[PDB]
């Protein structure tokens, strides 16, 4: 629908690519559009488990620009899923697809697709004069795992870039400060790792020793 | 000490002193199950393993990126220097130098971002050490699921593991409750607990463990008359002084 | 000026029940990048030259995939704290306290609360969905759609794992659990308690005896209801209330559009157009110019991924703060000053 001025032959977009052209024989304006379009994801279990896959076409509404069509075609809000059988049950999420849809390899085995379950349904018996009070208790022990430090690294720039080459080293002498800056950043990281470990573990400065008699009223450590 | 922590989570210490053997058995059994749980699952130490794997992958990616030509005729310094005189070679060497310097800069930038994330994790771990190991925390879910009693640290490669000991209520029972009790034209409110009824008789118990007691003047306090509290229930409040007279 | 004296104290004779809002970003948009489409779009010569670089987009896509996984992890950590979908009772008699502006509305297909409906209307996303077909980008050339330009240059937006309906379900479960059981469901089984008795427990938590609550129950319920209504009025009146969430959306859109606009950079080559270079030059000089363009566009992608990583670190800090606030202000009563609003929580 573009109307070119008579001195114009090509049209360009914001990315400076030619998206419109005037045909030189019949002086009509033609839009130019790239052929390739649309995100593609592949869904697999382990290759040690099976070689079956499911392919998600993120910009295809199957209700085609697909590689192949199988017996199982399921349309999600994350795209058109091909190769997975849709079931009506809700499970926990195994392989996340997106928009509330997950995938799994279940039982004569195939890839299934389902809506993820958020949890078990519950209803509290609320009343304006009723209370629930526990009669017992459970002593529970749970684990929490937190990273504290990572590995400290150092880099020889001349060894990495110009390994045992004098001509390369002499040409690399024109940069210098960039490698000093990289090693400054890595040295800061390396000092920070030991600081992290000290701040987590060296809180108390008295090395307390446990008593030799381990009678703690029945509690055992 | 564990009775003090029970007082911390709002349970009277006689509950602990009367169930000490059961509490010690439950604690020992849970600590014993921790070892079995960690040994049974293989993805327990996934965070520490991902830290190790990410550092190894970054170094190996740096090693593999030396095969990039970066627009030069070859990625091999010796192959460039064997075929070309120094003026023609210097262009290719400068291309390789720019590309490899970019690779080192990308590695250092991603290491700085990862170190910031690790620093946030270590600050959280130090806070959890101070507030769960060196004390008893009132913050919900900061030191495990349930009412926090105490925590124990354990050293791990590139990290720390906390064993949060918590109090989880169990075996709840329905009761009829009331906000206040009218005895002598006065409204009576519980000092520390909650009024409950088993169907016929009214008691007052602590809120986190069922321990019913006779509603007395020592158990309650008096505020106003019985005309303003919505849902006040007629019951007797036993004064212990008057039987002694 | 405080009227200090060595034997004078000021003691309040009344109180106001105040409700205030705190808005926290939790997740940002998930993106994925095709290097071959962005740098060498439908050019086989450019693709064969980009094979010599190769692993840098594997590194970039690894970083972007880590960000995209972290966004769903952030949303899960904030909202899926309890794995127990509690339901509100059908009889809404809570001693005069009314939660209709925060409880789900069954007359709407989204099953959102009125306040949540106002918030979702007041944040304008950059897309009405996540499926933009090739046909409607081909048939709407004259509109010059920014999403069509981004997708033709290999930039796609991945949908979140949890939909807004599932997030509203988690929020409704948390609200129902709080209203019916106090802080008990965040620590174990949900133990029911009447809502005036629960409010008396909170009053005892902030150091006020519970007879104050029981003797001023109607006034306290009226103050709570009025403050909840004023929250709706203030959010619907103020246009810059959701500025943090809108800034997150705008920053992601601006970064993708900057990536699209940077394809016009010559980077020291004779042209920024691969087809214009390949139409005039033989493969050697074409290789020189295309290598310049490849280095420049790879630098643009690396800059985008670095800034996305820094923004994702900031968003992760905000999501950790939101998860902590959910645990310590929704699942319990907090003693920390100003952590859960101004005043005694
Ligand atoms: C895929 O295409 C179908 C068919 O055009 C879309 O379904 C329509 O959706 C609109 C909007 O909700 C409804 O008014 C129509 O009644 C629907 N038609 C049918 C036949 O279902 C569907 O929404 C598209 N998918 C996506 C993700 O956009
Ligand atoms: C409170 O709970 C504990 C453990 O959950 C109960 O102790 C168990 O009681 C049964 C029956 O007497 C025994 O078979 C188990 O061996 C006990 N376990 C332990 C660890 O001691 C206890 O009976 C419960 N108490 C009440 C009043 O319900
Ligand atoms: C509610 O509690 C009261 C007091 O514990 C119970 O009354 C006692 O019941 C036992 C067994 O029937 C008798 O031996 C006592 O003499 C009763 N005491 C009094 C003061 O009456 C009552 O039975 C309980 N009711 C229910 C339904 O459990
Ligand atoms: C609680 O006890 C008081 C006192 O016995 C009851 O008040 C009586 O109510 C009746 C009926 O209205 C009157 O005829 C009496 O004169 C009242 N007596 C006093 C001293 O006020 C009250 O009704 C009882 N409440 C319940 C719910 O049973
Ligand atoms: C405590 O404050 C409340 C609210 O500010 C007061 O309630 C108001 O009282 C005036 C005068 O009676 C009425 O006109 C308003 O309609 C009331 N507002 C509400 C929301 O009920 C209350 O009177 C104050 N109490 C004291 C003892 O000062
Ligand atoms: C029990 C009661 O009065 N509920 C009302 C409700 O009907 C109304 O829609 C709402 C609007 O603010 O206010 C409250
Ligand atoms: C938003 C809302 O529900 N507002 C209600 C209104 O619909 C109702 O007519 C009025 C009286 O019941 O109370 C208020
Ligand atoms: C070019 O020639 C064709 C016939 O081959 C004719 O139809 C067309 O109009 C011509 N275009 C001009 C003269 O611009
Ligand atoms: C309390 O009563 C309700 C029914 O009103 C019931 O659903 C619930 O299980 C009871 N709680 C118990 C027995 O702990
Ligand atoms: C509880 O609800 C019942 C049933 O409507 C009512 O008769 C009673 O007065 C209510 N009690 C309170 C304290 O609201």
Swiss-Prot record, chain B:
Effect ascribed to mutating residue 171 to H: In strain: Kappa/B.1.617.1
Coiled-coil region list: 49-93
Glycan attachment positions: 174, 198, 234
Phenotype for residue 81 to F: In strain: Omicron/BA.1
Residue ranges of the region described as Heptad repeat 1: 20-70
Effect of substituting residue 50 to N: In strain: Delta/B.1.617.2, Mu/B.1.621
Disulfide links within the chain: 132-143, 182-226
Function of the protein: Subunit of the fusion protein that is processed upon entry into the host cell. Mediates fusion of the virion and cellular membranes by functioning as a class I viral fusion protein. Contains a viral fusion peptide that is unmasked after S2 cleavage. This cleavage can occur at the cell membrane by host TMPRSS2 or during endocytosis by host CSTL. In either case, this triggers an extensive and irreversible conformational change that leads to fusion of the viral envelope with the cellular cytoplasmic membrane, releasing viral genomic RNA into the host cell cytoplasm.
Protein name as it appears in the record: Spike protein S2'
Originating organism: Severe acute respiratory syndrome coronavirus 2 (2019-nCoV)
Primary gene name: S
């Amino acid at each position: 629908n573009k109307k070119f001025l008579p001195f114009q032959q090509f049209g360009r977009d914001i990315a400076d690519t030619t998206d419109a052209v005037r045909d030189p024989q019949t002086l009509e304006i033609l839009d130019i559009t790239p052929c390739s379009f649309g995100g593609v994801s592949v869904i697999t279990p382990g290759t040690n488990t099976s070689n079956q896959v499911a392919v998600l076409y993120q910009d295809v509404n199957c209700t085609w620009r697909v590689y192949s069509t199988g017996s199982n075609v399921f349309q999600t809000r994350a795209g058109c899923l091909i190769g997975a059988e849709h079931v009506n049950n809700s499970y926990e999420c195994d392989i996340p697809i997106g928009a509330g849809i997950c995938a799994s390899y279940q039982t004569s085995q195939s890839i299934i697709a389902y809506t993820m379950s958020l949890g078990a349904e519950n209803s509290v018996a609320y009343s304006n004069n009723s209370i629930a009070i526990p009669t017992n208790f459970t002593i529970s022990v749970t684990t929490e795992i937190l990273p504290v430090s990572m590995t400290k690294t150092s880099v020889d720039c001349t060894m990495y870039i110009c390994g045992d080459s004098t001509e390369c080293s002499n040409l690399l002498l024109q940069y210098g400060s960039f490698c000093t800056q990289l090693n400054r950043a890595l040295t800061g990281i390396a000092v920070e790792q030991d600081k992290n470990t000290q701040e987590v573990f060296a809180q108390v400065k008295q090395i307390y020793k446990t008593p030799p008699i381990k009678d703690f009223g029945g509690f055992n450590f | 000490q564990m009775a003090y922590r029970f007082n911390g989570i709002g349970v009277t210490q006689n509950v602990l002193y009367e169930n000490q053997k059961l509490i010690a058995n439950q604690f020992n059994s849970a600590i014993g199950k921790i070892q079995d749980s960690l040994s049974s699952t293989p993805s327990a130490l996934g965070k520490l393993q991902d830290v190790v794997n990410q550092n190894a992958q970054a170094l190996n990616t740096l090693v593999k990126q030396l095969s990039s030509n970066f627009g030069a005729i070859s990625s091999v310094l010796n192959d460039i220097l064997s075929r070309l005189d120094p003026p023609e070679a210097e262009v290719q060497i400068d291309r390789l130098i720019t590309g490899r310097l970019q690779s080192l800069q990308t590695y250092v930038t991603q290491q700085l971002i990862r170190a910031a994330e690790i620093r946030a994790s270590a600050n959280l771990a130090a806070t959890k050490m101070s507030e769960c190991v060196l004390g008893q925390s009132k913050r919900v879910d900061f030191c495990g699921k349930g009412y926090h009693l105490m925590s124990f640290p354990q050293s791990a490669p590139h990290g720390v593991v906390f064993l949060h000991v918590t109090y989880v209520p169990a075996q709840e029972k329905n009761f009829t409750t009331a906000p206040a009790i009218c005895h002598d034209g006065k409204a009576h409110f519980p000092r520390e607990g909650v009024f409950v009824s088993n169907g016929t008789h009214w008691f007052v118990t602590q809120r986190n463990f069922y321990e019913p007691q006779i509603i007395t003047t020592d158990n309650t306090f008096v505020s106003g008359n019985c005309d303003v509290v919505i849902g006040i229930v007629n019951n007797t409040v036993y004064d212990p002084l008057q039987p002694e007279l | 000026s405080v009227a200090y004296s060595n034997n004078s104290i000021a003691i309040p004779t009344n109180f106001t029940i105040s409700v205030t809002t705190e808005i926290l970003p939790v997740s940002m948009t998930k993106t994925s990048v095709d290097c071959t489409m962005y740098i060498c779009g439908d050019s086989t010569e450019c693709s064969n030259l980009l094979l010599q670089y190769g692993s840098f987009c594997t590194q970039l896509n690894r970083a972007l995939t880590g960000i995209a996984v972290e966004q769903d992890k952030n949303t899960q950590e904030v909202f899926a704290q309890v794995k127990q979908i509690y339901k509100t009772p059908p009889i809404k008699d809570f001693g005069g306290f009314n939660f209709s502006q925060i409880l789900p509305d069954p007359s709407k297909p989204s099953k959102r609360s009125p306040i949540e409906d106002l918030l979702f209307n007041k944040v304008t996303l950059a897309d009405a969905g996540f499926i933009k077909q090739y046909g409607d980008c081909l048939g709407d050339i004259a509109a010059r759609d920014l999403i069509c330009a981004q997708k033709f240059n290999g930039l796609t937006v991945l949908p979140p794992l949890l939909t807004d309906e599932m997030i509203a379900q988690y929020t409704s479960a948390l609200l129902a659990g709080t209203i019916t059981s106090g802080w008990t469901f965040g620590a174990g089984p949900a133990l029911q308690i009447p809502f005036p008795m629960q409010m008396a427990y909170r009053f005892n938590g902030i150091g006020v005896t519970q007879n104050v609550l029981y003797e001023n129950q109607k006034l306290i319920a009226n103050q709570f209801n009025s403050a909840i209504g004023k929250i709706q009025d203030s959010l619907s009146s103020t246009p810059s209330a959701l500025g943090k969430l809108q800034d997150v959306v705008n920053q992601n859109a601006q970064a993708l559009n900057t990536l699209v606009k940077q394809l016009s950079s010559n980077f020291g080559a004779i042209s920024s157009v691969l087809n214009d270079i390949l139409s005039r030059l033989d493969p050697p000089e074409a290789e020189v110019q295309i290598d310049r363009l490849i280095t420049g566009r790879l630098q643009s992608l690396q800059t985008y991924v670095t800034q996305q990583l820094i923004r994702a670190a900031e968003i992760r800090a905000s999501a950790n703060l939101a998860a902590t606030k959910m645990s310590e202000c929704v699942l319990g009563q907090s003693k920390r000053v100003d952590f859960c609003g101004k005043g005694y929580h």
